[PDB]
Amino acid sequence: CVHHIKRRDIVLKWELGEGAFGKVFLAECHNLLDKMLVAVKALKESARQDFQREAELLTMLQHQHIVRFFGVCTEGRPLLMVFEYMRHGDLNRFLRSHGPDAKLLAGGEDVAPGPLGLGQLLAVASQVAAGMVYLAGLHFVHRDLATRNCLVGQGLVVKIGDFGMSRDIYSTDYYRVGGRTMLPIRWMPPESILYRKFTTESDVWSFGVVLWEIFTYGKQPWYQLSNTEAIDCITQGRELERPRACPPEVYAIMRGCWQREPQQRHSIKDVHARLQALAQAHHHH
Ligand SMILES: COc1cc(-c2cn(CC(=O)Nc3cc(C4CC4)nn3-c3ccccc3)nn2)ccc1-n1cnc(C)c1
Numbered sequence: 001c002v003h004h005i006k007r008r009d010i011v012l013k014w015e016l017g018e019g020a021f022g023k024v025f026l027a028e029c030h031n032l033l034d035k036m037l038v039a040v041k042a043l044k045e046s047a048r049q050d051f052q053r054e055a056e057l058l059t060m061l062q063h064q065h066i067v068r069f070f071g072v073c074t075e076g077r078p079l080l081m082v083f084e085y086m087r088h089g090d091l092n093r094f095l096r097s098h099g100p101d102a103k104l105l106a107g108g109e110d111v112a113p114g115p116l117g118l119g120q121l122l123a124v125a126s127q128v129a130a131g132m133v134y135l136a137g138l139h140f141v142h143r144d145l146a147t148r149n150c151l152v153g154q155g156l157v158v159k160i161g162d163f164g165m166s167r168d169i170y171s172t173d174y175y176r177v178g179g180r181t182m183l184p185i186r187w188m189p190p191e192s193i194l195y196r197k198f199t200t201e202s203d204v205w206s207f208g209v210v211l212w213e214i215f216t217y218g219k220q221p222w223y224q225l226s227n228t229e230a231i232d233c234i235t236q237g238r239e240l241e242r243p244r245a246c247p248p249e250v251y252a253i254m255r256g257c258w259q260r261e262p263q264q265r266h267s268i269k270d271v272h273a274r275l276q277a278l279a280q281a282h283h284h285h
């Protein structure tokens with residue numbers, strides 16, 4: 001039940017990013033909800049079946065913390081996928097520009113430049129956890145949860161996607177095991193690195209790594225290490241250090257996501273419930 005969009009109704013503004021399989025542009029869309037900003041993904045190239053499967057999946061996935069999908073454009077070439085426009089771009093970039101050095105990075109006119117506070121970091125964390133609760137409820141395995149795969153809209157609205165253009169400007173976040181198989185090893189637990197076992201339990205481990213990215217203002221996990229050294233540390237069971245901005249109670253949540261046995265990891269629903277309770281308790285303080 002994929003919604004179709006006339007090519008005449010899409011006005012491309014500029015190219016945001018490019019990957020091996022697609023191109024993402026900022027665009028204007030007419031008669032969707034007159035003149036609306038949207039983000040358009042163009043299919044570069046089998047590929048048409050993957051595009052069809054994705055469009056169907058994105059029409060079915062509907063949640064306030066999953067990237068909004070408006071439809072496709074199958075009239076002519078390239079094939080297009082229309083997504084919502086999220087002003088603040090990807091969450092990794094957003095965290096890096098609203099960190100301890102935000103004042104140095106800020107434009108002269110930027111509103112109240114400075115590092116995000118605890119309340120804001122907990123609201124970002126709780127929103128990503130809510131999206132992961134929804135996917136787990138559908139028995140859907142993301143396999144590449146990371147802040148680079150989240151978008152931030154005006155009003156600190158956070159939504160999860162799966163971009164693969166992430167595999168271009170964030171090519172350093174992937175390890176090539178062979179051919180075209182790019183693994184986000186720094187976000188993966190030992191069973192995924194060793195045997196490519198991806199489940200809702202390997203996604204909860206990645207959510208723990210997302211919490212660490214959030215509380216370090218977007219640092220790359222294991223940044224001190226090469227890909228082979230990070231693989232060795234993870235399989236040996238080394239844990240990421242508690243971030244300076246991370247309260248001990250948030251680090252206890254990360255540790256719950258990082259239990260060695262996948263079945264011993266806390267469920268994403270309990271992780272979200274705990275994050276939502278900490279965000280509520282801090283609201284007025
Ligand atoms: C990086 O920025 C954007 C990048 C996209 C975008 C979208 N997609 C596809 C995409 O997100 N796909 C997707 C989402 C999911 C959900 C987690 C469950 N699953 N899959 C999925 C499934 C099977 C196979 C491949 C993917 N790729 N790029 C869109 C807007 C934006 N942007 C906005 N605003 C701005 C300024 C940019």
Ligand SMILES: [Cl-]
Pocket residue numbers: 251252255
């Ligand atoms: Cl602890």
